Amino acid sequence: SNALDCRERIEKDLEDLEKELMEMKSIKLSDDEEAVVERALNYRDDSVYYLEKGDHITSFGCITYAEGLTDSLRMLHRIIEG
Amino acid sequence: ALDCRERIEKDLEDLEKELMEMKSIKLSDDEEAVVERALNYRDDSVYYLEKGDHITSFGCITYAEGLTDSLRMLHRIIEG
């Protein structure tokens, strides 16, 4: 067992992901990058599904995967790039 | 299931292959940071698995998979 996949941690992870997704949508992305965003949104939706069915392990894996997708996009766009 | 030892071990092998193959192609400086981070998180997963922390190990490897898969999606062999 581990508190990393408890309900409140997953809820906060989701809130954090949704913030970064809005941040990435605030800038110009290539079509390929937009497809990464869409995949991250799909995995956000999956994380919520598993959380709601009480499967915290799968929920946690989905939101961390989505965070990896999104964090990579953030890293490819230095805030001082433009 | 997804975080059982057998599954994490397979994830770790699969990711090593994906990263060795990604780290030999033309990458931008920013992409190099992402690759480095994925390798670091793979290493973290390996460590936590050794200690029997399956949830922690699983989180590290799925995060690293997301980092890596994003780059794969930006480098389709046929871009179209």
CATH of the domain at A45: 1.20.1270.90
Under an 8 Å CB criterion, which residues of B touch A? Answer: 1-3, 28, 30-31, 33-34, 37-38, 41, 53, 55-56, 58-59, 62-71, 73-74, 76
DSSP assignment, residue B34? H
Task: Give the amino acid at B7.
Answer: R
Contact B34 A61 (CB under 8 A): no
CA distance B12 to chain A (A): 14
Phi (first) and psi of residue B75, to 5 degrees: -135, 45
Contact at 8 Å (CB) between A59 and A47?
yes
| Elucidation technique | X-ray
The structural domain count of chain A equals 1
Nearest partner of A2 among B9, B3, B5, judged by Cα: B3
Which residue pairs, CB below 8 angstroms and at least 24 apart, start in B39-42? B39/B64, B41/A68, B41/B67, B42/B12, B42/B15, B42/B16
Structure tokens given for A65: 């995967």
H-helix segments, chain B: 5-22, 29-50, 54-73
A41 CB neighbours in chain B (<8 A) are none
> At what resolution in Å was this solved?
1.3
Q: Domain range spanning residue A71?
A: 1-82
Q: How far apart are the first and last CA of chain A?
A: 44
CA distance A8 to chain B (A): 16
